[PDB]
Short mmCIF file of C-alpha atoms and ligand atoms in Angstrom, two decimals:
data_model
loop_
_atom_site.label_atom_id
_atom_site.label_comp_id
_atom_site.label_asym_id
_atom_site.label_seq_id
_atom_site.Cartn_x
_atom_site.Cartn_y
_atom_site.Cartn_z
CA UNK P 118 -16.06 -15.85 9.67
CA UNK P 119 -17.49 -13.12 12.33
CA UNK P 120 -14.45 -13.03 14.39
CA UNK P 121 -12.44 -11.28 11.66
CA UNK P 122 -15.43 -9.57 10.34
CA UNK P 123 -15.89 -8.26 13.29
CA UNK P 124 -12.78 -6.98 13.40
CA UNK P 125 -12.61 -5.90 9.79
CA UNK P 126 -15.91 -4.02 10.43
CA UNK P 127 -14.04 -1.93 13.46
CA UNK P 128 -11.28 -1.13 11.55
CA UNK P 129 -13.33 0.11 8.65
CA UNK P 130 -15.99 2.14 10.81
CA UNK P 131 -12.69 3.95 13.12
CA UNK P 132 -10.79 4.72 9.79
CA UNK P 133 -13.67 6.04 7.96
CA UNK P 134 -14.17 8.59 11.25
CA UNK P 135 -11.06 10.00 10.17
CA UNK P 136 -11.24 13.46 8.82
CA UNK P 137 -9.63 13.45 5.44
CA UNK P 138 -10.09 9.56 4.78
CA UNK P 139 -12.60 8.63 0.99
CA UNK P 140 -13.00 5.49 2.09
CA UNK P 141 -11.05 2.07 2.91
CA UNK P 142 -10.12 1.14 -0.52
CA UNK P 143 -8.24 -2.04 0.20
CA UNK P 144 -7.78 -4.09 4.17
CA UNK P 145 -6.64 -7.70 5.30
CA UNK P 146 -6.03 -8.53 8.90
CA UNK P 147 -5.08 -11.61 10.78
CA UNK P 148 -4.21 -12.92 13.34
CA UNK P 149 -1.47 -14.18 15.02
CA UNK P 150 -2.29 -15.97 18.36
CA UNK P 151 -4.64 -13.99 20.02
CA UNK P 152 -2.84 -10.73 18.10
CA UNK P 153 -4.26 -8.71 15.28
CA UNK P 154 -1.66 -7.97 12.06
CA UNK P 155 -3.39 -6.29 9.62
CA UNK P 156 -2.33 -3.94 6.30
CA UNK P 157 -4.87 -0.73 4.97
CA UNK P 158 -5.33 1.53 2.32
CA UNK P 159 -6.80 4.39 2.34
CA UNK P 160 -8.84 6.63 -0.03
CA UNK P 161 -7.82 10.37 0.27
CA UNK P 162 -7.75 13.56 -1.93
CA UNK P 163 -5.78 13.59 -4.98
CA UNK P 164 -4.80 16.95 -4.46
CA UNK P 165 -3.34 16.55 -0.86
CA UNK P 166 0.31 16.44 -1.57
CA UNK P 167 2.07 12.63 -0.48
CA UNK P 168 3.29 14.11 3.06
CA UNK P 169 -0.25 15.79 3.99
CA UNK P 170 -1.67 12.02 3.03
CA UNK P 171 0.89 10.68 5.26
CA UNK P 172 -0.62 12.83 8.21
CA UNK P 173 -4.19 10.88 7.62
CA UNK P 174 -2.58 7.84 7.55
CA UNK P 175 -1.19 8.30 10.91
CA UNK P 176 -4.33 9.87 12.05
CA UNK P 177 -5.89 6.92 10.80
CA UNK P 178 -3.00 4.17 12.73
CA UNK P 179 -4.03 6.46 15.58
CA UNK P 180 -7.49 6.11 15.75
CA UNK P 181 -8.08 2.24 14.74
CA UNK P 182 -4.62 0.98 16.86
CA UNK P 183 -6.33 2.80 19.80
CA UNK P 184 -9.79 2.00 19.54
CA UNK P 185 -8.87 -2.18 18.90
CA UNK P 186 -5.87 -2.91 21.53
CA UNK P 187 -5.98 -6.59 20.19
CA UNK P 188 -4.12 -4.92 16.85
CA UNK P 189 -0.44 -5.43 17.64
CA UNK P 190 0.70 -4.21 13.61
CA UNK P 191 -1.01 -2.07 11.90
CA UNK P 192 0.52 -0.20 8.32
CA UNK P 193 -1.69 2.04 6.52
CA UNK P 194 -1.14 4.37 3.57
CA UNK P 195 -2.69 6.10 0.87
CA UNK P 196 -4.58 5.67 -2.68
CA UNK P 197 -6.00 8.83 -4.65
CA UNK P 198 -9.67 9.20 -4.71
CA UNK P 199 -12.16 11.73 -6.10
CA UNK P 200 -15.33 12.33 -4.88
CA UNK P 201 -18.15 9.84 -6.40
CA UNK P 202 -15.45 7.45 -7.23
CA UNK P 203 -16.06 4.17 -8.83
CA UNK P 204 -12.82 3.37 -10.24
CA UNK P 205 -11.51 1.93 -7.30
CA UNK P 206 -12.90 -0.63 -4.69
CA UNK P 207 -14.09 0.32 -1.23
CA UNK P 208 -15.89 -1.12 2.04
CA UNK D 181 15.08 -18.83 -2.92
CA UNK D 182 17.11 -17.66 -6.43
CA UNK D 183 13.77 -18.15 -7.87
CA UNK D 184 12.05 -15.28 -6.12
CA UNK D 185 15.01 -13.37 -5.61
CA UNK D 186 15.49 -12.95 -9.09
CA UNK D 187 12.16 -11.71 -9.63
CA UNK D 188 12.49 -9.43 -7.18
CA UNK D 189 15.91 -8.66 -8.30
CA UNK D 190 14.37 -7.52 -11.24
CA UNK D 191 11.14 -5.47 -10.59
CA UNK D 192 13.27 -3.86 -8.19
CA UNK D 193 15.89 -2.59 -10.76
CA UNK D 194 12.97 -1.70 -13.18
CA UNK D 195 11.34 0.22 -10.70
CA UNK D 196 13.96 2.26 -9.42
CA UNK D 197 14.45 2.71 -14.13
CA UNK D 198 11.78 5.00 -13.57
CA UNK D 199 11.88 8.85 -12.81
CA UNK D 200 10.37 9.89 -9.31
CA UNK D 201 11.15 6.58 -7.82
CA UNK D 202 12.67 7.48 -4.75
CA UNK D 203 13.41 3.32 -4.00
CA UNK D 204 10.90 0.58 -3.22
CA UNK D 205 10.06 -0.05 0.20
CA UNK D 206 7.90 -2.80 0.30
CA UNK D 207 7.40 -5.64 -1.89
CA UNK D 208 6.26 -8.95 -1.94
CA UNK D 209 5.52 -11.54 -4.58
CA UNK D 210 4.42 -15.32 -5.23
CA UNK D 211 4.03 -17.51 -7.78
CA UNK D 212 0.52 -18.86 -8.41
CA UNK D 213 0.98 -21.67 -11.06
CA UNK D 214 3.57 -20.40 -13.78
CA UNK D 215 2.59 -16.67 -13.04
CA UNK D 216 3.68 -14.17 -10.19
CA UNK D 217 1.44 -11.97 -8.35
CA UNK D 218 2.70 -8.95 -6.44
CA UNK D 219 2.29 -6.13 -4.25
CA UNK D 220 4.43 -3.22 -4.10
CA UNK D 221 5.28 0.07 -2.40
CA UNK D 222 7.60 3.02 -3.68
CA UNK D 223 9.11 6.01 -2.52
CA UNK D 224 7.98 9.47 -3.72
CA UNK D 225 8.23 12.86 -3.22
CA UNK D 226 6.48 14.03 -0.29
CA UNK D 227 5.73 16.93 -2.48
CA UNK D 228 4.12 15.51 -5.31
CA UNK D 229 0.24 15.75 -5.10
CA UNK D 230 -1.20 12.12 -4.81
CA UNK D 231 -3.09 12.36 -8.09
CA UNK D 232 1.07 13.03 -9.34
CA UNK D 233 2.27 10.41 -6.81
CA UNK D 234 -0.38 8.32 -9.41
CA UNK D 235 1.27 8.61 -12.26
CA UNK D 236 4.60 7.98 -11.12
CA UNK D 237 2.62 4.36 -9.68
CA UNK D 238 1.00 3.66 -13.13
CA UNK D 239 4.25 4.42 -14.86
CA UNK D 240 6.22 1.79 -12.39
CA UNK D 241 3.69 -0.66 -13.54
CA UNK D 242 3.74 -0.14 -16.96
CA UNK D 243 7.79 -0.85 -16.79
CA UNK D 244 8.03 -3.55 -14.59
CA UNK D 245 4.84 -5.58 -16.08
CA UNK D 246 6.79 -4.95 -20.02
CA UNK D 247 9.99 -6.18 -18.33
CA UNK D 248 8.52 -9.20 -16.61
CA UNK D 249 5.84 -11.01 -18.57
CA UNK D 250 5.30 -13.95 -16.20
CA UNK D 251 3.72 -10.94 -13.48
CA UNK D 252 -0.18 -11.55 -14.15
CA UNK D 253 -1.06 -8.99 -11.41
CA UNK D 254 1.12 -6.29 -9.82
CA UNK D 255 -0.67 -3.37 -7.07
CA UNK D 256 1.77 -0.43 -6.95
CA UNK D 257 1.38 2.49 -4.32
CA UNK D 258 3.25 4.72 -2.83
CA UNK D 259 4.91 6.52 0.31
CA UNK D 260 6.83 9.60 0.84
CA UNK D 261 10.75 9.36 1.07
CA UNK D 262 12.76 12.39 1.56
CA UNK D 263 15.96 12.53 -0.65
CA UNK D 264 18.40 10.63 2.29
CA UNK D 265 15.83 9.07 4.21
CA UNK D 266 16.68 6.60 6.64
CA UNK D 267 13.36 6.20 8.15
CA UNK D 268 11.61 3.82 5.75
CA UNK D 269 12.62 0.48 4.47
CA UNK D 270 13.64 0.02 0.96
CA UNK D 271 15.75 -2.65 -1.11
ZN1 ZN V 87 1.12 7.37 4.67
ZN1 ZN V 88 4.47 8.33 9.63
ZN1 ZN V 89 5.21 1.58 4.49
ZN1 ZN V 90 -0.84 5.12 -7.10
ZN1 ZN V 91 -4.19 4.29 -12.09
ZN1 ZN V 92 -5.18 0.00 -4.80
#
């Protein structure tokens, strides 16, 4: 499996650089031909309000659709996530 | 497909039962065995806070897992929608 951990790895490093992402709480990727389709979730602060999470998920879609050009579809949005979380899953 | 689209039919309209639903926008959902699995995606006020965005999730879940009692697993997140939004999908 280290083509798509590979990839999963990239994703998870260039979202995490982010300011304002807590984590990748949930990712799958494939691919389709030599493409990359993949669907995140991200870990931010409970407090931001919905459209100020929206802005890190772009930031995110920004930063990992720009650093991988093999990713052809990328959709990421947002979970709540306190600091020292355990409650949810992460990378 | 009247299998599925019944389903979907239905945790649809339960969904949208709840208040600060602002429409689904993404959904999908299998059968595995007897039991569904599914993944979903509603609109909320791009005011709310995320923890409140939360609530409104957890409440969606609570409604459309009573309603449906062949759903084994259901995810439910959310996405801002402003009140006449044409820029998101929804059902
Ligand atoms: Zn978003
Ligand atoms: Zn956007
Ligand atoms: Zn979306
Ligand atoms: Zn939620
Ligand atoms: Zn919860
Ligand atoms: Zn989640």
């Amino acid at each position: 499996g280290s083509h798509m951990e590979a990839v999963q790895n990239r994703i998870v490093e260039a979202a995490e650089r982010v300011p304002g992402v807590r984590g990748v709480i949930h990712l799958r990727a494939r691919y389709v031909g030599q493409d990359i389709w993949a669907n995140m979730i991200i870990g931010v602060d409970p407090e931001n309000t919905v459209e100020q999470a929206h802005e890190i998920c772009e930031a995110v879609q920004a930063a990992v659709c720009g650093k991988i050009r093999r990713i052809e579809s990328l959709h990421v949005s947002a979970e709540a996530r306190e600091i020292g979380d355990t409650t949810k899953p992460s990378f």
